Amino acid sequence: RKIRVGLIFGGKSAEHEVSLQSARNILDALDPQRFEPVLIGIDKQGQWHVNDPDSFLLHADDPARIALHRSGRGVALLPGAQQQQLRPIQQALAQIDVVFPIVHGTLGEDGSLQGLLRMANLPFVGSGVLGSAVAMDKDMAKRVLRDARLAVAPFVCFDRHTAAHADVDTLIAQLGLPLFVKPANQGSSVGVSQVRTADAFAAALALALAYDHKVLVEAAVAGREIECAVLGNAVPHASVCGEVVVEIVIPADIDAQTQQRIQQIAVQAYQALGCAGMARVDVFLCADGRIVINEVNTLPGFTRISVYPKLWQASGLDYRGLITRLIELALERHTDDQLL
Amino acid sequence: RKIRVGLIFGGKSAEHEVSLQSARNILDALDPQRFEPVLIGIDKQGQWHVNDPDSFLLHADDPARIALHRSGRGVALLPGAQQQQLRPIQQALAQIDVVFPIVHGTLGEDGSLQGLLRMANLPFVGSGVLGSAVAMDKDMAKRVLRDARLAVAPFVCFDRHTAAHADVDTLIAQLGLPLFVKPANQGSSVGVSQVRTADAFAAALALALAYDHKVLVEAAVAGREIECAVLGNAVPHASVCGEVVVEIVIPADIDAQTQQRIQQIAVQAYQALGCAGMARVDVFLCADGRIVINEVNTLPGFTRISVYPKLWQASGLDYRGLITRLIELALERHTDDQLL
Numbered sequence: 001r002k003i004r005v006g007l008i009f010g011g012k013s014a015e016h017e018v019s020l021q022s023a024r025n026i027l028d029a030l031d032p033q034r035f036e037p038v039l040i041g042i043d044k045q046g047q048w049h050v051n052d053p054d055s056f057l058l059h060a061d062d063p064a065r066i067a068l069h070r071s072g073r074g075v076a077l078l079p080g081a082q083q084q085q086l087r088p089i090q091q092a093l094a095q096i097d098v099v100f101p102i103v104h105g106t107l108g109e110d111g112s113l114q115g116l117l118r119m120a121n122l123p124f125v126g127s128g129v130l131g132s133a134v135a136m137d138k139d140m141a142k143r144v145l146r147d148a149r150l151a152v153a154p155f156v157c158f159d160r161h162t163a164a165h166a167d168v169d170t171l172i173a174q175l176g177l178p179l180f181v182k183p184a185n186q187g188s189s190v191g192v193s194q195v196r197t198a199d200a201f202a203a204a205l206a207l208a209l210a211y212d213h214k215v216l217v218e219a220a221v222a223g224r225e226i227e228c229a230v231l232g233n234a235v236p237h238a239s240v241c242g243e244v245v246v247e248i249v250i251p252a253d254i255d256a257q258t259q260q261r262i263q264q265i266a267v268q269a270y271q272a273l274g275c276a277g278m279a280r281v282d283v284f285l286c287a288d289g290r291i292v293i294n295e296v297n298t299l300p301g302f303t304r305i306s307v308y309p310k311l312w313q314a315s316g317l318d319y320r321g322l323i324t325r326l327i328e329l330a331l332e333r334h335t336d337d338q339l340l
Numbered sequence: 341r342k343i344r345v346g347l348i349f350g351g352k353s354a355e356h357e358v359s360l361q362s363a364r365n366i367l368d369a370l371d372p373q374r375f376e377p378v379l380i381g382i383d384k385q386g387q388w389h390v391n392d393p394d395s396f397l398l399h400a401d402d403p404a405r406i407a408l409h410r411s412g413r414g415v416a417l418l419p420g421a422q423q424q425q426l427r428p429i430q431q432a433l434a435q436i437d438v439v440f441p442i443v444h445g446t447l448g449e450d451g452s453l454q455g456l457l458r459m460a461n462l463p464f465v466g467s468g469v470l471g472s473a474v475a476m477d478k479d480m481a482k483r484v485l486r487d488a489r490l491a492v493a494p495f496v497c498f499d500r501h502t503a504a505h506a507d508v509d510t511l512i513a514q515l516g517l518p519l520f521v522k523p524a525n526q527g528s529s530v531g532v533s534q535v536r537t538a539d540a541f542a543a544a545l546a547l548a549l550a551y552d553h554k555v556l557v558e559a560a561v562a563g564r565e566i567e568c569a570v571l572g573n574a575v576p577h578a579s580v581c582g583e584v585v586v587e588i589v590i591p592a593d594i595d596a597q598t599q600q601r602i603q604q605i606a607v608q609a610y611q612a613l614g615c616a617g618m619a620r621v622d623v624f625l626c627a628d629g630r631i632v633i634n635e636v637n638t639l640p641g642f643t644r645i646s647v648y649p650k651l652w653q654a655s656g657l658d659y660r661g662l663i664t665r666l667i668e669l670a671l672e673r674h675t676d677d678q679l680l
């Protein structure tokens with residue numbers, strides 16, 4: 001009755017090395033009374049490799065050099081299999097009971113991996129196909145958030161076939177300056193430009209369009225940057241808040257009343273987008289102080305030093321306890337999903 | 341240079357037999373100058389079976405008895421494989437170049453299958469992960485539609501953990517009677533109740549909740565039922581309209597001006613939800629005549645007698661031509677998706 005926990009990690013992402021460290025840390029905090037790990041790493045090229053727990057990493061202890069051991073032990077997925085759904089090309093691999101996916105990159109976060117795991121009838125930690133796909137698409141997300149009567153930065157969304165037409169003056173007239181230019185579909189922090197003058201705009205648009213088919217152009221939100229951790233499925237709970245300064249400060253220096261209402265905004269956002277298990281919600285806090293949601297991230301960091309587990313720590317939930325709860329959440333959802 | 345077309349069909353769905361007939365028909369219309377088929381059928385239990393084109397079906401010609409030949413030739417999916425991503429358990433299976441998925445049921449339509457196909461770097465016909473997941477979730481869909489300033493039936497959405505609280509009088513006060521009660525997440529036509537009096541309501545809610553975690557309760561829309569076919573990705577086109585009477589009449593008996601604007605509504609809806617390749621949009625036409633969107637279906641029927649190909653036929657696009665275009669759409673999207 002010890003449950004097998006399939007950790008899937010890595011990916012073609014700038015955040016590849018973060019996923020490595022995340023997997024390392026989850027491994028060390030995994031309650032050994034309840035869980036045995038199975039290690040599946042994805043290299044920067046997209047190739048899947050099974051590993052042994054003591055030899056998944058190269059230069060594990062050098063963060064400038066840390067790398068996946070490409071063991072070349074390949075993976076087969078048996079679509080509609082009910083048992084041993086993940087199989088080795090080449091002898092046998094422990095039955096996996098729950099997948100903890102921490103694959104950064106487009107496919108790991110956009111509901112694509114989640115669909116593959118659904119197709120294999122595997123319980124898995126985090127948002128399902130819908131919540132992942134919607135939260136990842138910033139344009140879709142903000143539109144769902146806005147409809148839920150939550151505040152988002154005002155914005156316009158262009159594609160390739162409409163960007164060619166962009167009128168800068170009308171944008172500046174509508175949205176002001178600076179303008180934040182971003183791809184909708186993330187892998188993000190890439191293609192994000194603060195355009196300060198009208199002349200910078202054309203180039204920001206082009207850069208963003210190198211990374212996605214849709215690009216958002218938002219007005220500036222003046223206000224402090226608060227991050228709030230969310231956990232659970234049906235009745236989500238919110239961590240204490242954390243403030244970003246440019247350096248993260250936890251617990252953020254704000255009112256209990258302003259904290260309480262950022263917590264409720266975070267929960268309402270999490271529910272509008274249909275998230276599960278976990279999310280980090282990043283908002284802006286205005287002088288007003290209105291609260292404007294910047295981002296809902298369905299795949300937060302899981303290193304010891306990552307903001308998400310740090311926020312929960314500061315809320316009286318430790319790293320071990322977090323991991324275990326995320327696993328239980330994944331199993332509860334799977335068994336409710338089972339019946340219907 | 342003949343391209344291999346992986347037809348994936350069947351599924352645990354009441355619409356299983358429709359998917360069978362769809363696959364039969366697509367097979368016969370597949371341009372033999374351009375395409376060779378590969379047949380993968382999914383039985384009512386979820387098991388995948390490869391078949392030969394002349395022996396995929398049992399009782400092919402008896403629609404009361406038509407069934408999948410469960411050849412027991414199983415399928416392996418090689419996650420992150422770039423070549424032979426679909427492999428046989430047991431000798432070899434033609435390289436698939438594009439998948440035409442027509443799997444009815446929750447997994448085939450909700451973006452789950454789509455994610456599995458994305459994970460295997462396979463081009464595929466129809467909406468991607470986001471468009472499928474969003475259009476399938478009727479609650480999410482209507483919220484995105486509403487935000488796009490398109491009219492949807494007014495409605496309330498309950499889950500299991502909030503249905504217990506439902507106030508019928510307030511609902512009738514808000515929404516009127518009859519009330520249409522439906523699961524959000526389809527496989528749908530199941531769990532749909534017209535509740536005529538306040539007493540019928542409790543039982544409709546329970547039934548719907550047997551089939552999904554969310555259930556919509558909508559006001560009645562009085563108005564004629566029009567269906568409109570949509571095709572393409574970036575610049576979608578709309579078929580002539582078709583009227584539902586209770587018997588489908590094509591071309592619907594309406595104004596060219598009312599048709600033109602249902603066509604634009606269909607396109608705007610298709611774009612707001614982020615659909616690709618194909619959809620059937622079902623609207624209501626009011627006396628007014630406002631247009632209210634009932635449904636956007638990302639997986640329409642593909643038998644000869646199915647409304648979607650019939651609508652295009654009536655628009656000067658034949659069945660062969662439809663299939664081929666859907667394939668080209670799938671390849672164009674895949675190669676644009678390739679770069680970013």
Ligand SMILES: Nc1ncnc2c1ncn2[C@@H]1O[C@H](COP(=O)(O)OP(=O)(O)NP(=O)(O)O)[C@@H](O)[C@H]1O
Pocket residue numbers: 153180182186187188189190192218219220221222225294295
């Ligand atoms: N509309 C806006 N108004 C004011 N500041 C913004 C706005 N959009 C982005 N920023 C700032 O730019 C940063 C990056 O934008 P964000 O959408 O968070 O990008 P990301 O791709 O998710 N990468 P990360 O910086 O890791 O979040 C934010 O943390 C803010 O400091």
Ligand SMILES: Nc1ncnc2c1ncn2[C@@H]1O[C@H](COP(=O)(O)OP(=O)(O)NP(=O)(O)O)[C@@H](O)[C@H]1O
Pocket residue numbers: 493520522526527528529530532558559560561562565634635
């Ligand atoms: N709000 C409403 N107002 C008026 N009629 C409705 C409403 N909702 C549904 N109907 C009617 O009920 C039918 C079924 O609802 P619909 O959402 O189309 O279900 P479905 O699960 O997609 N199955 P199908 O009937 O095949 O579409 C519609 O075609 C209409 O005739």
Ligand SMILES: [Mg+2]
Pocket residue numbers: 282294295
């Ligand atoms: Mg952010």
Ligand SMILES: [Mg+2]
Pocket residue numbers: 622634635
């Ligand atoms: Mg309908």
